[PDB]
Design an enzyme around this catalytic site. Structure first.
Site, PDB file in Angstrom:
ATOM      1  N   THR A  47       0.898  -1.148   0.000  1.00  8.88           N
ATOM      2  CA  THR A  47       0.000   0.000   0.000  1.00  8.88           C
ATOM      3  C   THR A  47       0.935   1.196   0.000  1.00  8.88           C
ATOM      4  O   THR A  47       2.021   1.101   0.576  1.00  8.88           O
ATOM      5  CB  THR A  47      -0.932   0.023   1.239  1.00  8.88           C
ATOM      6  OG1 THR A  47      -1.852  -1.077   1.179  1.00  8.88           O
ATOM      7  CG2 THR A  47      -1.709   1.335   1.333  1.00  8.88           C
ATOM      8  N   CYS A  48       0.562   2.291  -0.663  1.00  5.30           N
ATOM      9  CA  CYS A  48       1.328   3.535  -0.564  1.00  5.30           C
ATOM     10  C   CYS A  48       1.685   3.755   0.885  1.00  5.30           C
ATOM     11  O   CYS A  48       0.808   3.736   1.740  1.00  5.30           O
ATOM     12  CB  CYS A  48       0.535   4.732  -1.085  1.00  5.30           C
ATOM     13  SG  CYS A  48      -0.020   4.569  -2.788  1.00  5.30           S
ATOM     14  N   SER A  49       2.967   3.934   1.176  1.00  2.63           N
ATOM     15  CA  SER A  49       3.396   3.924   2.575  1.00  2.63           C
ATOM     16  C   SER A  49       2.655   4.940   3.428  1.00  2.63           C
ATOM     17  O   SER A  49       2.282   4.651   4.569  1.00  2.63           O
ATOM     18  CB  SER A  49       4.897   4.168   2.671  1.00  2.63           C
ATOM     19  OG  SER A  49       5.579   3.137   1.991  1.00  2.63           O
ATOM     20  N   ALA A  51      -0.240   5.763   3.430  1.00  2.04           N
ATOM     21  CA  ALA A  51      -1.643   5.429   3.688  1.00  2.04           C
ATOM     22  C   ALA A  51      -1.816   4.205   4.585  1.00  2.04           C
ATOM     23  O   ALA A  51      -2.951   3.830   4.908  1.00  2.04           O
ATOM     24  CB  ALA A  51      -2.382   5.224   2.375  1.00  2.04           C
TER      25      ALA A  51
ATOM     26  N   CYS B  48       2.497   3.196  -6.448  1.00  2.00           N
ATOM     27  CA  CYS B  48       3.114   2.745  -5.219  1.00  2.00           C
ATOM     28  C   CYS B  48       3.608   1.320  -5.403  1.00  2.00           C
ATOM     29  O   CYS B  48       4.791   1.048  -5.212  1.00  2.00           O
ATOM     30  CB  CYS B  48       2.142   2.888  -4.052  1.00  2.00           C
ATOM     31  SG  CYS B  48       1.810   4.655  -3.658  1.00  2.00           S
TER      32      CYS B  48
END
Lengths: 157, 157
Positions: A47-49, A51, B48
């Protein structure tokens, strides 16, 4: 899905402690507290860090400074995997909670099917919960690049 | 949706050159070549864990070593934005192609609605195209963490 102003489902989330498996009623666990809760489709998944876990780890001090009592990570995973994931990420400041049968996630209306990857899992979302009442709910909308994150939560405070 | 084994519809793609805006049917560009084509929902959009253009840039020499004549990137964007995006990513190797009205993407059946973000855009996918025939088609399925990255294409080669 759940609406802001509604109390969380009166359900449990699990945690492994020295006592063994503990099943926290979320309405007891989060009673009398301002809580930040965020979900992912799976422990150890990308996951996008900003988030998920890394984002809340680095923003934990700023979140607590704005009145957050508890930051918690939930996923449709069992409690052993959630404990391992917190350890791998050094998630000192974050409570790792397991929804192993997806019952909490389904009660929120925030499940999603990952098919052969992992069966039924959670969508990505983050909440501010005040004494068990959902005050803020931000849900990922990937097709329209609604790129909310821990900073979105910080600003909501 | 276009399928493996099918020949491309001869839809138009545009470019900015010293002539200004130009456009060509795609088979004029791709005929007689083994082409790797990578499509994104938008120039300058973040990634990402999803496949991304810099991944194709890092593997460009290896792709060419395995017989790729041309690596191209397409998006539902105009040619000025595609040129700027190529420059920002130092993608001089990669052919930047614009599908400004989504006609190419719709011809392939690989569109997706992004609503208020950007209207109709392309799904993220990658192809190997041998003299116009789609011999490999990999379409992203984010819910199952399946990505159309350069290593996937390299393995198909």
């Amino acid at each position: 899905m759940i609406a802001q102003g509604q109390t969380l489902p009166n359900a449990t989330l699990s945690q492994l402690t020295k006592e063994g498996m503990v099943h926290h009623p979320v309405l007891e666990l989060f009673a009398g507290k301002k809580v930040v809760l965020f979900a992912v489709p799976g422990a150890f998944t990308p996951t996008c860090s900003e988030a998920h876990l890394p984002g809340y780890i680095v923003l934990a001090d700023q979140l607590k400074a704005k009145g957050v009592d508890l930051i918690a990570s939930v996923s449709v995973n069992d409690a052993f995997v959630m404990k391992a994931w917190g350890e791998a990420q050094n998630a000192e400041e974050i409570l790792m909670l397991a929804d192993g049968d997806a019952s909490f996630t389904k009660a929120l209306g925030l499940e999603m099917d990952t098919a052969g990857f992992g069966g039924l899992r959670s969508q990505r979302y983050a909440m501010i919960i005040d004494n068990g009442v959902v005050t803020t709910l931000n849900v990922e909308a990937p097709k329209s690049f609604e790129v909310s994150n821990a900073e979105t939560i910080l600003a909501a405070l």
